[PDB]
Amino acid sequence: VEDLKVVRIASVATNVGGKTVYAGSASLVVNGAFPEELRKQGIKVEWVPAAMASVGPVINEGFASGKIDFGIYGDLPPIILNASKPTVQLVAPWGTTSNSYLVVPKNSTAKSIKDLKGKKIALHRGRPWELAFSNLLQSEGLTFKDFKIVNVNPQVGAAALASGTVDGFFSLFDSYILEDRGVGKIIWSTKTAPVDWKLMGGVWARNDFVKQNPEITQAIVTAYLKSVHWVAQDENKETYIREYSNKIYPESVNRREYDQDNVSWRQRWSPLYDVALQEHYRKAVAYAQASGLTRTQADVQQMLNPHFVATALKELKLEGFWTPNAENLY
Structure with missing residues (x-):
């Protein structure tokens, strides 16, 4: 009988043939050592699975009402939320999805x-x-x-x-x-x-939650990256494909998504707030407004917080494990 802190974490979820798929990053984190490692920290993670089109009225909404603390999903929804009002921050990019x-x-x-x-x-x-x-x-x-x-x-x-x-x-x-x-x-x-x-996308945090609980936010990010470091090694690529990928589709389809790419297996999982990330976010916020998904443009800078990955990479001795990408002069 412990005194645990309940931390509510959302993900996009799908039932396929008796099982539950989570959008790539989440499956690994829901099914890995992540819950248990946070438990040692005095933190109880609670999952809020959301069907692929409950994302607004469950995830963005849970964020809005403060009923959710973290969310592992894509960048499009949180962009739409943040345009309405600054609500949520990227505290761990999941790489390129x-x-x-x-x-x-x-x-x-x-x-x-x-x-x-x-x-x-x-x-x-x-x-x-x-x-x-x-x-x-x-x-x-x-x-x-x-x-x-x-x-x-x-x-x-x-x-x-x-x-x-x-x-x-x-x-x-x-x-x-x-x-x-x-x-x-x-x-x-x-x-x-x-x-x-x-x-892109990753782990999004309620702004008020971060401001109030920097320590816990850190424990989550550090714990997250531990899982990500494990999957990002080549020896575990096949395990990811067979256990944690998108089960709506055959393993070979999932496997081909990573085949012959200009981004390596490890780099696909990069949490770096590099120039290519910033640019994607600048571009994505502009497109969200132009396609009329939002009237307004979210402030990109206030929505990205690199402090937790920086702390985590130093703490985990992973400062050189990923490499930052530059602007591609196309």
């Missing part, structure tokens, strides 16, 4: 986005990967104006491309299934893009 991919029907002429001018492209609007799409367009001097954008989820979009109902499909690693059923081909991917075009 996903590449994005351009897929064309198996028998297509198309070799790069240029070839799809005036064509139908299936894209789930208002999703983080829309930023990568926008970037790619910008990179080659194009706009949304130059395409008919079919706004559909990845499943409808996948079915549509397989049919030849669209001429292109922009999505994440679910794209590989289309290659496997022999009905699509990937022709572009963020594996050839700057690091900031990749999806």
Whole structure:
């Protein structure tokens, strides 16, 4: 019978064939040594699992009402929350969560986005990967104006491309299934893009919680990075793939997401607040407003707090384990 501090931590969760998937980082932290190590510190973690579209009325809302303290999820929601009012801080970046991919029907002429001018492209609007799409367009001097954008989820979009109902499909690693059923081909991917075009996020903390409890916040961040250091070693890549990845999809699909990438296995897990992170966040906040997800732009600086990872890396002797990325002069 101990005197524990209850710390409420949210994650995005999904039940697949009797089990629960958590968005990459969380599964490792929910299923690893993290809860137990915090227990030694006098901290009881309590999980607040959230279905993939309860994120607003459960996570952002729990943050808003102070009923949640930490949240392990993507950068898009907390950006939307923070625009309304500064509420939440990034205290541990989880690295780069996903590449994005351009897929064309198996028998297509198309070799790069240029070839799809005036064509139908299936894209789930208002999703983080829309930023990568926008970037790619910008990179080659194009706009949304130059395409008919079919706004559909990845499943409808996948079915549509397989049919030849669209001429292109922009999505994440679910794209590989289309290659496997022999009905699509990937022709572009963020594996050839700057690091900031990749999806991000991590461990978000309620601003008031941090201000009141720097010590506990630190214990969480230090404990988090311990888990991350463990998974970021190559010998544990296969364990991650088999135990902690996205089980909606076959292991080979999950495995291909990391294949031939310009970011190593270890670097995918980087918690560094490097130039490429800052830039991604600057870019993401601009896109959130332009796509009308928010009226306002969140102050990027007040939303990023590098103090805890800095303390943790010194404490864990991991100051040289990751390397900071610079601005990619594209």
